[PDB]
RNA sequence: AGGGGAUCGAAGAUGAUCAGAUACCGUCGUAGUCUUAACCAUAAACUAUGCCGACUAGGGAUCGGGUGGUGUUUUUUUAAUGACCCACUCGGCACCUUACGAGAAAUCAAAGUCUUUGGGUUCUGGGGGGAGUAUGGUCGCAAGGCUGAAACUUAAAGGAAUUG
């Protein structure tokens, strides 16, 4: 299984706290989503962190499975994603796609656009509809940073987080990259702080 | 043309089939 | 519908037509040979092929 | 109002089966029911099932796999002789090499490939494949 | 249920309803009334032998133009007037 | 073939409304298949409010309003500059502009 | 040349898949129509019929030709293809192309008795386009195609000699019927059977095991 | 399935999905199969050995794909208690 | 209106996307050299093709435009990406979590510094 | 058949309009419109969708009843209450999204669980006209209601969508 150290430490714990990756949508809860944890008063509902840390951990060990690491692409056409899959596609293969889909990517390669990964990664689901229907008709894996709202109709493994911060979808994306960047052994020490900041991952309003 | 007005045209002329052979029993 | 006409025109183009006479040809096998006569002209000679096996 | 009790029984399954669902809770759990499923369930079709007991009727709880394509009541309960069991099976069997129609006889109830080796028949109320 | 009963002891209801929805066949309305026996000049035969008594010059319908030549024939067994063909090219001249 | 689930009206549970009769023709048409649309104007107007209080007792007092409901039928409420015409896609949609 | 420009394009152009039982077993989709005939160089076409469909225009009509294309060996495989056009001839030749890109397997059985190289279907699958649904029911040896002759070619053209067939609905449309029967033969393999009750060690996609030779 | 003896033909044996055990047919352009691979004992992944995961395209079609791979990972153990038996 | 076409916006795209390390964006020297790059029948298009690209170098170099993807600008990928906002962004982590919040930390067992006040209503 | 008979108003009378206008439009205006007693037995009497039973996806709103919450407000700050807020549940009029599903389509949580065809049951249809006509019954004061053909004639009528 896993060699215990995987658990979630301290030291991210508050990370994902601060970033409010725990409160996710309001009292309107899709059925597929058992993440939440004992919801709060005032209609927040409180994802569990725990689960959300398995889920991000078995995502990053399917990425690391993909032997050619161009075939990885990450969808964000939401506002707040697309710095943080920039930088997920400078120290990972991970052809980036920020901005608009060019629908028609996943057929007719006779566009300019054609792309034909092995896994696709998308940040919000609802706003990326089009993305992961295309996927759905060539045979492609999805991973989705899936809210408790969110329409997870054709969506594989998906990290239950917030995606109304503008940090809980940097932090995700940043922790996402961390142990592909762990497994593949980028990073020598798993118990590495790796201090290069989270900042990086994060959407400037200038 | 109208179904309406065939069913009346019918009907009034039920009434004169039914008083014409009244005049022989 | 009217039931009268013109019956004087009956026969009409019967009578015009030209009469033309058989013209005489030697007689066809009749029965198995016909057999015969059929399968090799159609299925071993290609002769008639003009542009869609058009045999007339 | 509710005539059959194996047709219901029999319906649920079938929705459950349909959309993959690997339980159903039937209601309410006549002996027939199990003696049924007992048949389905010597052939592999449906697996564990277990019988809840309130005390008005009970419940039935099967455990389904992705192993059943259809079962089925044949409703009413034709008499059927033993040449006429070959006549069901080639309507409503796919193949002859497998499924088999259920069919109470006087010596329980039994499927139709192995009421011909006890050489006896009887009323039919089904059909699994 | 899809209509129709299905019990057991249920075939008088299903054999006398057939036998109603029967008479809406055109075939075997006709041939339980018999009308052909009573009506289609005919006696129900395929051929019926009769007299010519006059010739008829029928016209064609739309879209057609022509002389039909056909001939009034009058049946012997019945006595009815009826109108027959005379199918050819110009034999109406044999029927005189 | 149909061309609305309420078909033209508001009637799911009643059998009868009782009709009212239009304003512009006066046509009789059931209240729930009726159009109605309130009219709240000022009295005078919107733009001649200065020549009422300029020469006005008891200043600038209410300067009251005409409340009234108006009922049509279809046929005068289309004519009238009114609801007319939606696509069949916008046919469904029921909020006011 | 085939300069093949995706991922199995050129996985079958270097050779690394050899039969077009990988690509079925993992259901890898196709866009190019040199992958069929490579892999199945002894599949045939069959045009079924040209009817030319009409529209309104500015000027009369504008006609364009709606052909229908079965192609596939007879042993196994078999495609079907409509495709409209503006001429006769290249609406056939695009055809070719829509039925080979849609050549899916087909499952022979046997009636009874297994006894060697399985003639019949071993099921029986319905389908349905429209409101023309297609039937077929296993037949014994020696019991031909029963079948009409446009739905018959085609089944003959994917393998199966022995078959029963009970249509319904309005027949008379080709491309229903056509494809109809396409469904049909399709869904053979998606009936589970008892035979196919073993647990699979589930294999590895080829765009994995070969993953190096991809287009960069 | 086999002939009379040996031989095996049915060429082409189906793969099956994992959350419904139903064959996955080679038109179903939906279906996908989850590919994860594991680490030992030092947290770095090992090319060449993987775990894999078949889901039909009905499943995902659902939306209810997220959870069957849920209890799936766990009963291999590659997962910890994000997924219960209990609702 | 002065409205170009696409004959001469999509050419003008066309030569940026192979001649940025060229041309630059004086009008005069885009137009003296669009002669023998680029094979342009009429004198007046080429003076069309070079008034429209000396507008794009102006939009370039001044914050990226979408839909012109050149041998180079994706490379701007380690100055205008990197280099958190300015000086800020040094610490932006430093407690606060809600009453709700806080039974979360000790049912998942690690045991985190949480300074937990009830949320005021 | 009595009472009432204000408004509106089949019929009728008039002014227009119109080539004509015994129609639309304007003004009158009987029967009727209301009621009591008694007939009539019809309607696009429509959700054009028979009734009973089980199962199959989510969502909010609302009506009636019930349960719980140191919840809000008012009585006597306080309580029981009444009205609200939150959560759950039964029953109901409905509505929104989607399609594993159905349909020829429009569309449908039923019009789904129907060629992989069987939960129980009642009624009705068999191309279009003739024709709901003729005749015979039976009911009605009557108007008419229910039941209900045949001769003959015809290759199309019809449904839903697409472009003009």
């Given at each position: 299984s896993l060699p215990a150290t995987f658990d979630l430490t301290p030291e991210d714990a508050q990370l994902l706290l601060a970033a409010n990756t725990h409160l996710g949508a309001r009292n309107v809860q899709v059925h597929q989503e058992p993440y939440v944890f004992n919801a709060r008063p005032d209609g927040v509902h409180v994802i569990n962190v725990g689960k959300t840390w398995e889920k991000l951990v078995l995502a990053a060990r399917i990425i690391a499975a993909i032997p050619n690491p161009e075939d990885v692409v990450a969808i964000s056409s939401?506002?707040?994603?697309?710095?943080?899959?920039?930088?997920?596609?400078?120290?990972?293969?991970?052809?980036?796609?920020?901005?608009?889909?060019?629908?028609?990517?996943?057929?007719?390669?006779?566009?300019?656009?054609?792309?034909?990964?092995?896994?696709?990664?998308?940040?919000?689901?609802?706003?990326?509809?089009?993305?992961?229907?295309?996927?759905?008709?060539?045979?492609?894996?999805?991973?989705?940073?899936?809210?408790?709202?969110?329409?997870?109709?054709?969506?594989?493994?998906?990290?239950?987080?917030?995606?109304?911060?503008?940090?809980s979808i940097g932090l995700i994306w940043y922790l996402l990259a961390r142990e592909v960047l762990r497994l593949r052994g980028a990073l020598v020490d798993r118990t590495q702080p790796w201090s290069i900041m989270p900042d990086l991952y994060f959407y400037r309003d200038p | 043309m109208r179904a309406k007005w065939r069913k009346k045209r019918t009907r009034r002329l039920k009434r004169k089939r039914r008083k014409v052979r009244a005049r022989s029993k | 519908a009217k039931v009268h006409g013109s019956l004087a025109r009956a026969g009409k183009v019967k009578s015009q037509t030209p009469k033309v006479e058989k013209t005489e040809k030697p007689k066809k096998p009749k029965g198995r040979a016909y057999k015969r006569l059929l399968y090799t002209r159609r299925f071993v000679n290609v002769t008639l092929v003009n542009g869609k096996r058009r045999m007339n | 109002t509710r005539s059959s009790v194996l047709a219901d029984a029999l319906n649920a399954i079938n929705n459950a089966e349909k959309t993959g669902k690997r339980q159903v809770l039937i209601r309410p759990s006549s002996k027939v029911i199990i003696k049924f499923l007992q048949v389905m369930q010597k052939h592999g079709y449906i697996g564990e099932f277990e019988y809840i007991d309130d005390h008005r009727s009970g419940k039935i709880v099967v455990q389904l796999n992705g192993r059943l394509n259809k079962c089925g009541v044949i409703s009413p309960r034709f008499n059927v002789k033993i040449g006429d069991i070959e006549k069901w099976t080639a309507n409503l069997l796919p193949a002859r090499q497998f499924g088999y129609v259920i069919l109470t006889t006087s010596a329980g109830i039994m499927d139709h490939e192995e009421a011909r080796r006890k050489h006896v028949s009887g009323k039919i109320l089904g059909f699994v494949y | 249920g899809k209509g129709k009963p299905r019990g057991l002891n249920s075939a008088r209801k299903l054999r006398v309803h057939r036998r109603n929805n029967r008479w809406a066949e055109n075939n075997y309305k006709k041939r339980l009334l018999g009308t052909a026996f009573k009506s289609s000049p005919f006696g129900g035969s395929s051929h019926a032998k009769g007299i010519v008594l006059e010739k008829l010059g029928i016209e064609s319908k739309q879209p057609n133009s022509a002389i039909r030549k056909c001939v009034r024939v009058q049946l012997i067994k019945n006595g009815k007037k009826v109108t027959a063909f005379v199918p050819n090219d110009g034999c109406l001249n044999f029927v005189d | 073939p149909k061309k609305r689930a309420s078909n033209g009206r508001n009637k799911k549970g009643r059998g009868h409304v009782k009709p009212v009769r239009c304003v512009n023709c006066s046509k009789s048409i059931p209240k729930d298949k009726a159009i109605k649309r309130m009219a709240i104007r000022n009295i005078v107007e919107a733009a001649a409010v200065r020549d009422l209080s300029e020469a006005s007792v008891y200043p600038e007092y209410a300067l009251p309003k005409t409340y009234n409901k108006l009922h049509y039928c279809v046929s005068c409420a289309i004519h009238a500059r009114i609801v007319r015409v939606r696509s069949r896609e916008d046919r469904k949609n029921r909020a006011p502009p | 040349?085939?300069?093949?420009?995706?991922?199995?394009?050129?996985?079958?152009?270097?050779?690394?898949?050899?039969?077009?039982?990988?690509?079925?077993?993992?259901?890898?989709?196709?866009?190019?129509?040199?992958?069929?005939?490579?892999?199945?160089?002894?599949?045939?076409?069959?045009?079924?019929?040209?009817?030319?469909?009409?529209?309104?225009?500015?000027?009369?009509?504008?006609?364009?030709?709606?052909?229908?294309?079965?192609?596939?060996?007879?042993?196994?495989?078999?495609?079907?293809?409509?495709?409209?056009?503006?001429?006769?001839?290249?609406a056939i030749r695009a055809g070719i192309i829509i039925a080979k890109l849609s050549v899916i397997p087909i499952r022979r059985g046997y009636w009874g008795t297994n006894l060697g190289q399985p003639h019949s279907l071993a099921t029986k699958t319905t389908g349905k386009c429209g409101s023309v649904t297609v039937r077929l029911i296993p037949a014994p040896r020696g019991s031909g195609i029963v079948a009409s002759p446009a739905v018959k070619k085609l089944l003959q053209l994917a393998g199966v000699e022995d078959v029963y067939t009970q249509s319904n609905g309005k027949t008379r449309t080709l491309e229903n019927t056509l494809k109809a029967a396409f469904v049909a033969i399709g869904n053979t393999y998606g009936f589970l059977t008892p035979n196919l009750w073993a647990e699979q060690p589930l294999p590895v996609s080829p765009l994995d095991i070969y993953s190096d030779e991809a287009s960069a | 399935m086999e002939n009379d003896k040996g031989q095996l033909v049915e060429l082409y044996v189906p793969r099956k999905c994992s959350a419904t055990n139903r064959i996955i047919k080679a038109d179903d352009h939906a279906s996908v199969q989850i590919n994860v691979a594991k680490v030992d004992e030092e947290g770095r992944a090992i090319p060449g050995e993987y775990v894999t995961y078949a889901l039909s395209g009905y499943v995902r079609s659902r939306g209810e794909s997220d959870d069957s791979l849920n209890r799936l990972a766990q009963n291999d153990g590659l997962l910890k208690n994000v997924w219960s038996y209990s609702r | 209106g002065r409205v170009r076409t696409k004959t001469v916006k999509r050419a003008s795209k066309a030569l940026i996307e192979r001649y940025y390390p060229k041309l630059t964006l004086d009008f005069q020297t885009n137009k003296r050299l669009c002669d023998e790059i680029a094979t342009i029948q009429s004198k007046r298009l080429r003076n069309k093709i070079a008034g429209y690209t000396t507008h794009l170098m102006k939009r370039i170099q001044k914050g990226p435009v979408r839909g012109i993807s050149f041998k180079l600008q994706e490379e701007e990928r380690e100055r205008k990406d990197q280099y958190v906002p300015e000086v800020s962004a040094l610490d932006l982590s430093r407690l606060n979590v809600d009453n709700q919040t806080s039974d979360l930390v000790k049912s998942l067992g690690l045991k985190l510094p949480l300074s937990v006040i009830n949320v005021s209503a």
């Open positions: 939401r506002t707040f994603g697309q710095r943080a899959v920039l930088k997920f596609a400078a120290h990972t293969g991970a052809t980036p796609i920020a901005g608009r889909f060019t629908p028609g990517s996943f057929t007719n390669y006779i566009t300019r656009s054609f792309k034909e990964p092995r896994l696709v990664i998308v940040t919000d689901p609802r706003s990326d509809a089009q993305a992961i229907k295309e996927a759905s008709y060539v045979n492609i894996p999805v991973i989705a940073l899936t809210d408790l709202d969110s329409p997870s109709e054709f969506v594989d493994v998906a990290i239950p987080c917030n995606n109304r911060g503008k940090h | - | - | - | - | - | 040349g085939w300069v093949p420009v995706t991922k199995l394009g050129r996985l079958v152009k270097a050779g690394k898949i050899t039969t077009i039982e990988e690509i079925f077993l993992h259901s890898l989709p196709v866009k190019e129509f040199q992958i069929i005939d490579t892999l199945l160089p002894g599949l045939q076409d069959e045009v079924m019929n040209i009817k030319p469909v009409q529209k309104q225009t500015r000027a009369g009509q504008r006609t364009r030709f709606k052909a229908v294309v079965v192609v596939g060996d007879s042993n196994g495989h078999v495609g079907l293809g409509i495709k409209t056009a503006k001429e006769v001839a290249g | - | -």
